[PDB]
Design a protein around this ligand. Structure first.
Ligand SMILES: CC(=O)N[C@@H]1[C@@H](O)[C@H](O)[C@@H](CO)O[C@H]1O
Ligand SMILES: *[C@@H]1O[C@H](CO)[C@@H](O)[C@H](O)[C@H]1NC(C)=O
Ligand SMILES: *[C@@H]1O[C@H](CO)[C@@H](O)[C@H](O)[C@H]1NC(C)=O
Ligand SMILES: *[C@@H]1O[C@H](CO)[C@@H](O)[C@H](O)[C@H]1NC(C)=O
Ligand SMILES: *[C@@H]1O[C@H](CO)[C@@H](O)[C@H](O)[C@H]1NC(C)=O
Ligand SMILES: *[C@@H]1O[C@H](CO)[C@@H](O)[C@H](O)[C@H]1NC(C)=O
Ligand SMILES: *[C@@H]1O[C@H](CO)[C@@H](O)[C@H](O)[C@H]1NC(C)=O
Ligand SMILES: *[C@@H]1O[C@H](CO)[C@@H](O)[C@H](O)[C@H]1NC(C)=O
Ligand SMILES: *[C@@H]1O[C@H](CO)[C@@H](O)[C@H](O)[C@H]1NC(C)=O
Ligand SMILES: *[C@@H]1O[C@H](CO)[C@@H](O)[C@H](O)[C@H]1NC(C)=O
Ligand SMILES: *[C@@H]1O[C@H](CO)[C@@H](O)[C@H](O)[C@H]1NC(C)=O
Ligand SMILES: *[C@@H]1O[C@H](CO)[C@@H](O)[C@H](O)[C@H]1NC(C)=O
Ligand SMILES: *[C@@H]1O[C@H](CO)[C@@H](O)[C@H](O)[C@H]1NC(C)=O
Lengths: 1002, 216, 49
């Protein structure tokens, strides 16, 4: 049987308290929402394994348990742990007492310590050598199934065990179901309140809803896609296509050899057309030193080599470090040179008993004199006499004439420091030449159209193997792409050409609605067939979870290639080709004109981040906080600290500069009159309220209410405080509402708000008479729009979306800087005083090199993130400075820049490290539907409107402006005479009223 | 250059492709590659945002009327061709023709594929052919193209009367001017300089990343 | 790209989606309108002047 385990199987990890924060822990936990076993207790207590620990859950009415047992025979013959709590004499010992088959309660020792209706939970874990006890009891009132709720078990006697026990037994109630589960290293996201009791937790690797919670570290999700993980279909098996040759290689010719060359004439034996196993070389204990930095000793069998040369010679036991890249010595410079880029492995077994004889092994010879250094792997057989002096040497040794090729003497009577030692360079150069010495591994059959772990001639990887039509030449082995990664291979068994394209992979994105809306999920496997995976396949790939619909809606949560989901009809997530709007065909003609009779003065809230936190991260107190030696090593880098501190102080003074450039653009400070009579325009939402403790707006109070360390990093306070930015915002807002635009230009010129809005209508091409006829209606419309944006900013989180997110990238910018106090960068620990109190000065200098280089990788990229993000802030801040300039200090005649629609003005309200504008705009609402003509002819003359458009309902010809239907008869104060009517096309015959004509006739 | 190939590298795949040891040693650097992945996905999303701000400023679907009685201004070279299998312009076809991986770094497909980027461009062209400036601000108001040129003439302070007086002449000059665009855009490779250089620039950036896979 | 793309957005807004009075902002000469054209990762404007 199985039953639902909602939130059980959980324990506390440590004794540490966390407050109002979300933290992720991995440990041996029990997965959530999992079907766990339900058992009965009538007429049943089997033995369960304990290899991973247990989560125990019991329902009890008389506490029927008398001992947790851990041993082999459990009958006082051996060591077995015992637990008995008889309410005053708690005992936890491991000696030999005789227990029954089923211990029960009715209502060599190693430690000693004294401490339905009921639910009791117990957990036992085994790390690091002590003795734990977990215990937690809670009352329940339920008999059918598991109650819903989260109780977190806290170890009372917390002392981590570490005993290896893989077997335990349960003690069931027999005067009742119990839960038992298997434990796995799975990570959850456990929620701490301010108070110390864990209230909720998410197994974040359960469904895509929880996979959002892994990366968002929260319990509520926003409607959107999230990069959760990297899906890559796992290759099913392992494939190897080594060449067919299987003969045993004469490694006895180079190891079991009767004759070894010397360093002057060392044998360079190409080893090819054989099988190199190396396994007998591992099993041989004959080698004493097995040195190489190129290849590894032990993990070499899976590799197949280009061509291996066995350089056989003899040199002294102290000379074994001379065979190394970059080593300089007598024999190293006169007999055998190793390149710095030497690949291959030199082997030196002991030759205590082989290359020696009683009289002296006198056949090993070496050069001691040369006037030049040696090339790598050269063959110098020079037999000339070296010239020591200036005298010519006619083959006559003696003074100034010695011969370089010197010999050795090897005897078993000689000392072990002079005893012959064997060193052999099995030079494993992995070069271009074809692979011929592969490992002793059996081959497998070939697979196509399915990605598989391939190991072709030593090159490992995953990918698909299809036949190729390229004519690889004989001795042509691989096809490399631009990355020199193997793109094509020739199969060494069958002469065919095989492309390598690495296997299908991509990120895991999630389509989900909000957790307040639904729990139905959608997981994405992108840019693939639905083969390595209600399935929808597009150019973006396979979308698993949402229903494909042919009907197209507005796009809400995009997943790729313009296929996106939405949660409608019962309701479910539906994926479709995105509609690019409402399908609005326009009845175009050469005489079709559309003119709005009606508008709405909508106010669009565009929110621009204009400042930030004036951070000043001094390098000494950040990287080398409370340390003298770290600062002494940091000043060895010279000018990085002074230039980055100059950069940060430049950031701070430039944030003050741009907040001055966006607010203190006026030389003179204005204050509102005590009477807020502004012609019907309710400014009490935007003007500061004297009843508030800070002289700030009600809209700003919303901006401050819901719309919102000490590790060497600080914030500098702005020069313009919260109250000061408030008083600039009120000053420039008063300057607008009492002076129009002139206060930003020169002396402040008084204008009433009706006059101001009249001319700001005039500035976009709508005549101010519409305002002065409908001032009451537009007062109602603007005030109701203020109330609407009041509701929007008080009810929608995205009203602070594009500012709060900037506050966020600042927040996790500084927070990841703090994470570099916890991320290690190659050191042993990231805690500075832990390093300085433990780690020695020499490698302490190179790990401070790592912390300076990497802490300034994170930090200099945090600072270039400050400077590129501040190119964003400065672009938006010069943008906002111009928005202040020709929207607050002026009026923007430039369209769709200072708000959606025709911009009229904007209201600066202060915001935390930013500014918000209320771009008051003119948006038409509905139009009546008219015919037109390019010009009109009255007396043979062509007429054109100076301002506005000739319009017609089909019976009468009117002229109206482009953006309001204001029906006026055609007037010579709105039109003129230019040209004649026979050349213009589309002109129609009409009559022109003149503002001169009835005055002349009457 | 408005947008870029949404390149996105993986902490696992690009830096330490298919290696548990190297992925562990990169998580040894902590969140360091995670803000890099965050930054590159941010570049992807803001590139989408650039494309959205330049194209999906439009709130509706505008389509061209079946008749191109545009007052003498033939747009069949700049407007999508119904005879073409993909509804794109002819000059866009020569912008697609004359001017035009699996190894740890991928390219994310755009949220807007090429055909429906062309659909947004067709929408913007349609709005500025039959509706002009009005659909940018508010409701779609149908206005003739002759009116748009005549009122646009007023903007620069020349009177619109000259336009209707020489409508046929300027139709000839503007159509032949678009033809000169067609000829130059089809003949000189230098005419695509500011996009060819930037697509190449991204290509050399990716290619240098590729060349670091040879660098030791 | 984003500076030139906000430039392109204002360009499209003020030069496609409206008429710009900014002299020498929409190519050389007195700007009339502009025609968007899609291109591989770019926009080609046909600024009539
Ligand atoms: C559309 C139009 O121009 N209609 C008539 C035109 O045919 C006529 O020659 C002229 C003489 O008054 O009156 C007008
Ligand atoms: C749910 O319980 C049933 C009972 O047989 C079992 O078959 C199934 O595997 C369980 N589901 C999960 C996800 O464990
Ligand atoms: C109760 O426990 C104590 C030790 O904890 C033990 O010595 C005693 O025998 C127990 N009592 C019974 C009745 O088993
Ligand atoms: C938190 O602890 C306080 C005591 O500090 C207590 O009054 C309260 O009930 C606890 N729980 C909650 C949910 O506040
Ligand atoms: C080389 O000598 C060792 C020494 O015992 C021996 O074990 C090994 O098998 C020999 N190699 C041959 C015979 O190939
Ligand atoms: C090769 O020959 C040249 C001239 O004969 C000589 O200088 C050089 O040392 C020689 N190198 C070797 C490795 O023999
Ligand atoms: C060598 O490889 C080819 C590949 O098909 C095969 O025909 C032949 O049997 C192989 N040699 C041996 C001894 O199996
Ligand atoms: C997807 O699979 C089908 C058949 O399995 C194949 O024809 C097609 O080319 C594949 N496409 C991709 C992009 O893998
Ligand atoms: C405008 O008037 C024409 C003429 O009757 C009509 O066909 C059309 O549907 C009307 N409405 C629109 C939006 O064009
Ligand atoms: C114009 O629009 C407003 C709001 O959209 C509406 O209340 C009003 O009745 C409309 N008509 C007139 C004549 O104002
Ligand atoms: C302005 O709005 C407030 C909102 O509380 C309202 O009480 C007041 O009557 C409105 N009008 C004036 C002139 O203050
Ligand atoms: C407008 O175009 C229609 C056809 O689309 C045509 O019948 C009509 O005569 C044209 N009118 C003018 C004034 O060009
Ligand atoms: C379309 O443009 C071409 C230019 O190649 C021109 O020859 C043709 O007359 C135009 N058609 C119309 C209907 O304007």
């Amino acid at each position: 049987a199985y039953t639902n385990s909602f939130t059980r199987g959980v324990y506390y990890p440590d004794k540490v308290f966390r407050s109002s924060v979300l933290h992720s822990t991995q440990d041996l936990f029990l997965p959530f929402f999992s079907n766990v076993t339900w058992f009965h207790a009538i007429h049943d207590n089997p033995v369960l394994p304990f290899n991973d620990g247990v989560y125990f859950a019991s329902t009890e009415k008389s506490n029927i348990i008398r001992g947790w047992i851990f041993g082999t025979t459990l009958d006082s013959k051996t060591q077995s742990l015992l637990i008995v709590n008889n309410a005053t004499n708690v005992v936890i010992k491991v000696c030999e007492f005789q227990f029954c088959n089923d211990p029960f309660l009715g209502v060599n020792c190693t430690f000693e310590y004294v401490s339905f209706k009921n639910l009791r939970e117990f957990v036992f874990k085994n790390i690091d050598g002590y003795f734990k006890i977990y215990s937690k009891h809670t009352p329940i009132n339920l008999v059918r199934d598991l109650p819903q709720g989260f109780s977190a078990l806290e170890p009372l006697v917390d002392l981590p065990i570490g005993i290896n026990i893989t077997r335990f037994q349960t003690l069931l109630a027999l005067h009742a179901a119990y839960y038992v589960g298997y434990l796995q290293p799975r990570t959850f996201l456990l929620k701490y309140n301010e108070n110390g009791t864990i209230t909720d937790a998410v197994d974040c690797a359960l469904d895509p809803l929880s996979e959002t919670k892994c990366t968002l570290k929260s319990f509520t999700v926003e409607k959107g896609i999230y990069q959760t993980s990297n899906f890559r279909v796992q290759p099913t098996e392992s494939i190897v296509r080594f060449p067919n040759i299987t003969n045993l290689c004469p490694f006895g010719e180079v190891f079991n050899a009767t004759r070894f060359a010397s360093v002057y004439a060392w044998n360079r034996k190409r080893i090819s057309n054989c099988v190199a196993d190396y396994s007998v070389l591992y099993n041989s204990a004959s080698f004493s030193t097995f040195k190489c930095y190129g290849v590894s000793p032990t993990k070499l069998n899976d590799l197949c080599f280009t061509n291996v040369y066995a350089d056989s010679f003899v040199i002294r036991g102290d000379e074994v470090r001379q065979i190394a890249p970059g080593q300089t010595g007598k024999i190293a410079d006169y007999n055998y040179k190793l390149p710095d880029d030497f690949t291959g492995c030199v082997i030196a077994w002991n030759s205590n008993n082989l290359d020696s004889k009683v009289g002296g092994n006198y056949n090993y010879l070496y050069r001691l004199f040369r006037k030049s250094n040696l090339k790598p792997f050269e063959r110098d057989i020079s037999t000339e006499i070296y010239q020591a002096g200036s005298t010519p040497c006619n083959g006559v040794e003696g003074f100034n004439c010695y011969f370089p090729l010197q010999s050795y003497g090897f005897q078993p009577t000689n000392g072990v420091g002079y005893q012959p030692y064997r060193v052999v360079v099995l030079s494993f150069e992995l070069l271009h030449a074809p692979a011929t010495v592969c490992g002793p591994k059996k081959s497998t059959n070939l697979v196509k159209n399915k990605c598989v772990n391939f190991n072709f001639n030593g090159l490992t990887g995953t990918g698909v193997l299809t036949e190729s039509n390229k004519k690889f030449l004989p001795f042509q082995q691989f096809g490399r792409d631009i990355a020199d990664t193997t793109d094509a291979v020739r199969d060494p068994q069958t002469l065919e050409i095989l492309d390598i394209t690495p296997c299908s992979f991509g990120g895991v994105s999630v389509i989900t609605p909000g957790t307040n809306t639904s729990n139905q999920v959608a997981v994405l496997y992108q840019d693939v067939n639905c083969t390595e995976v209600n399935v929808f396949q597009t150019r973006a790939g396979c979308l698993i979870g949402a229903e494909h619909v042919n009907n197209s809606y507005e796009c809400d949560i995009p997943i790729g290639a313009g296929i996106c989901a939405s949660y409608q009809t019962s309701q479910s997530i539906i994926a479709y080709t995105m509609s690019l709007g409402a399908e609005n065909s326009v009845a175009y003609s050469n005489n079709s004109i559309a003119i709005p009779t009606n508008f709405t003065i909508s106010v669009t809230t565009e929110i621009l981040p204009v400042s930030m936190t004036k951070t000043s991260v001094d390098c000494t107190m950040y990287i080398c906080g409370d340390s003298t030696e770290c600062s002494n090593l940091l000043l060895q880098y010279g000018s990085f600290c002074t230039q980055l501190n100059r950069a940060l102080t430049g950031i701070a003074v430039e944030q003050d500069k741009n907040t001055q450039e966006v607010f203190a653009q006026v030389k003179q400070i204005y204050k509102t009159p005590p009477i807020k009579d502004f012609g019907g325009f309710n400014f009490s939402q935007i003007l500061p309220d004297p009843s508030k403790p800070s002289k700030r707006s009600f809209i700003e109070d919303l901006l401050f209410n819901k719309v919102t360390k000490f590790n060497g990093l600080t914030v500098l306070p702005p020069l313009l405080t919260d109250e000061m930015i408030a008083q600039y915002t009120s000053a420039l807002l008063a300057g607008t509402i009492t002076s129009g635009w002139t206060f930003g230009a020169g002396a402040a010129l008084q204008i009433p708000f009706a006059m101001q809005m009249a001319y700001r209508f005039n500035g976009i091409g709508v005549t101010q008479n519409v305002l002065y006829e409908n001032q009451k209606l537009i007062a109602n419309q603007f005030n109701s729009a203020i109330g609407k944006i009041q509701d929007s900013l008080s009810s929608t989180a995205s009203a602070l979306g594009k500012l709060q997110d900037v506050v966020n990238q600042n927040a996790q910018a500084l927070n990841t800087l703090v994470k570099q106090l916890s991320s290690n960068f190659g050191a042993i620990s990231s805690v500075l005083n832990d390093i300085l109190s433990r780690l020695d000065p020499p490698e302490a200098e190179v790990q401070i090199d790592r912390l300076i280089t990497g802490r300034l990788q994170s930090l200099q990229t945090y600072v270039t993130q400050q400077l590129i993000r501040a190119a964003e802030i400065r672009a938006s801040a010069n943008l906002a400075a111009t928005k202040m300039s020709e929207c607050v200090l002026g009026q923007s005649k430039r369209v769709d820049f200072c708000g959606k629609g025709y911009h009229l003005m904007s209201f600066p309200q202060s915001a935390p490290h930013g500014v918000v504008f209320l771009h008051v705009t003119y948006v038409p609402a509905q139009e009546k539907n008219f015919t037109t003509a390019p010009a009109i002819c009255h007396d043979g003359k062509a007429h054109f409107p100076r301002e506005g458009v000739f319009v017609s309902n089909g019976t009468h010809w009117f002229v109206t402006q482009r953006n309001f239907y204001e029906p006026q008869i055609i007037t010579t104060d709105n039109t003129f005479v230019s040209g004649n009517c026979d050349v213009v096309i589309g002109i129609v015959n009409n009559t022109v009223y003149d503002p001169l004509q009835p005055e002349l006739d009457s």
